[PDB]
Symmetry: C4
């Protein structure tokens, strides 16, 4: 809690990027999920594969656009893990998780505004365990999946160069984006997308469903527990 950062000008820009990023990340991804679901014709949409690209591809573009500014996180769990590694200050982190949180809700909120009809009607792009999977699994998938995301993140951090005015490493976007893409190609059937507390959170809010809200804890505990293990594995044993 070195409150000296708040005073820096750059620090406020970094939060603004993370907010807009996540706003963007959530709008594009979720708008895509829906555009799929509302499709009447067979193979007439982009498909679950299309969705998967949306998620890892946006991440890639975003981490690219904001790497040099905030360090391109767009994910609480990504911040959390980098925090446990102490490459981010307690002050910075809590500010980030908030901006991503507010980022998501506006991102998802925006879509519902463009297509409220099919929005509510088709899941509203809200994470929740799928028929045939116990919560025990949904959490397992979520944990291990986020381990892949974060472990990539650490492996893709520039050791020398850091975010403008800070000791927060530059993230090489391509591997991270792909990692996201991959984890989506496997976890979608389980509980759609995840490994992103702010993504699920932003979705649960604008959708508003007890069923949704009930499983919502998994998408916070899993991503965070994974990010934890990841940091551990990468620093304590590598």
């Amino acid at each position: 809690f070195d409150l000296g950062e708040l005073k820096l000008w750059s620090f406020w820009r970094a939060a603004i990027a993370e907010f807009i990023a996540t706003l963007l990340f959530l709008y594009i991804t979720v708008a895509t999920v829906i555009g799929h679901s509302k499709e009447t014709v067979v193979c007439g949409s982009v498909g679950l594969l299309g969705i998967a690209w949306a998620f890892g591809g946006m991440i890639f573009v975003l981490v690219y656009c904001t790497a040099g500014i905030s360090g391109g996180h767009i994910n609480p769990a990504v911040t959390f893990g980098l925090f446990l590694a102490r490459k981010v200050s307690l002050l910075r982190a809590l500010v980030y998780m908030i901006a991503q949180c507010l980022g998501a809700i506006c991102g998802v909120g925006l879509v519902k505004a463009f297509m409220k009809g099919p929005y509510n009607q088709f899941g509203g792009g809200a994470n929740s365990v799928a028929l045939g999977y116990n919560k025990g699994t949904a959490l397992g998938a979520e944990i291990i999946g986020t381990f892949v995301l974060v472990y990539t993140v650490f492996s893709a951090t520039d050791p020398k160069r850091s975010a403008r005015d800070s000791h927060v490493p530059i993230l090489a976007p391509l591997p991270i984006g792909f990692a996201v893409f991959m984890v989506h190609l496997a976890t979608i059937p389980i509980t759609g997308t995840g490994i992103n507390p702010a993504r699920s959170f932003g979705a649960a809010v604008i959708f508003n469903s007890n069923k949704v809200w009930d499983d919502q804890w998994i998408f916070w505990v899993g991503p965070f527990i994974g990010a934890a293990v990841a940091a551990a594995y990468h620093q304590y044993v590598l």
Copy 2:
């Protein structure tokens, strides 16, 4: 600005021929993919919307890679406009590019019609318009926010140090830009078609020539230009100290 001193430069007429030819191939490959997909009788026998998304984002990547060193690689009126507002492109240059791009599009699109007039007219001619189930206000919303993703990336992709030939127009990273065109398409095709191109929407509107299309055509210019503006401002005024 208005420095007519450029017109006289030999490099200036190339960066325009490139943008012209670049945008011609762009519309040809993409629109051709669109028709090709639509005329498909076999279910799941085409490349699908996912295929079309790639044809766009993909062409942008390639076309920008090819022409970045020469014209700076814009291929998009809204991308030029945004940098123009950033004062990284003269007003004189901008107006030329823009004419060559709209001029490139119309030929590119018209070449697809020449290839297969039959299924071309029959399946939308690859022109943007508002999809049933959406209000013109939303189409414009998606168009703005869509283009904000494209141009904000163009800004995030500019090269600080080196530039184009004969100018101070930055070389652009091709991949992040292509992926952006791609991403935006995956989410906007259901609504309008992923316009985020004026020159692209114009070329096909011109060649398809449908009133229903010409009607919504105004959104595809206003939306992009607005998005690009807000992007420029966001990158320049809000970010970049």
Copy 3:
């Protein structure tokens, strides 16, 4: 670099010259195999959307191209395509000797790769077009020729735009290439051209297929797949050398 004297048998004597040939042979053998095997696997599929679909095919072609140019860039210059060669020849980046040997290699290569797939699955191989280019119903020969010309232009123009000014292949003046852009160029063009004749843009890839499949209907249209890419090749070359860089 100086324009390499037009016919200097002198390279024949070079050990690296023959290596580059082989690399180009084997590369086209793998190119055709991985791709044509993919095409077949898609056609033989009984289940709706049980194959990889056309997008899957489009990738096979762009993808392998990417991978192959990467793997051979420093050994032969990464051509894998008579039309790319011919195009690099007109700009005098490649001697008339290498260009002719490369060409012979790519075909011999193409004919093996395909033949090797037919050897893996003869039934469906023959039952589903043999992975050969030909004009699709509802498209007149002239459009076929146009698509191929224009398509190849896209491929070649990118090759030129991908060549490295200060980095060349091993023991040669031939320019080294950036495989990713080139790969994508091939990918893109297929997405647009498959519906038409195929994604040709490869005299060798078309020839090897026609050879092993061997159909009158195929052999009839085959000429398009040579003239189209070359003309396209030439124009990109002229475009890049003459009206630009």
Copy 4:
């Protein structure tokens, strides 16, 4: 030299094997889970398609190898290790340790899938490789020898020359091409045997799924890849690659 009694004694040496173990583990978890999720799908086109599966396999390799080059040299594959061993770039000791780690990482990954979705997992081929109806075991072996050649020849072509891993004198590999190799081969071999080119990946799926029909053909995915890996090695080391 060869035996190298001293490799065991190094602290980095053990680190690598771990990476390789965690690596191969993830790989199988992510791919296999994708395969199942696809198969157990009820809706038509409701899944990611075989294309997604192919991507899963190539993409994972890409990513995984990007995370493990500097540490272990990013093999994640016996065939790749074997091929790199024949090129004397990986000692006999490190090759044996690597393969165990890769086999042990594999089964865990596959098992981890089963545990999550035992139901559809057993009902849909368990994601293990086997010759499919219509193809003769001979073709399966060729497609597997030829498909691995593509993989190993790329690994060899991605090989960095003036750079190595952390403390081992083992080459860092450029990830993207390799992943695409894996992606491509998958696109052409899946319909035949689902594109193995990975002893570790095949073995682990045969272990966890436990089927005779499967164990029957299980020799193809061991004999093939290694033969491919070796041929590649000979093409690249001997008949090519000089200055």
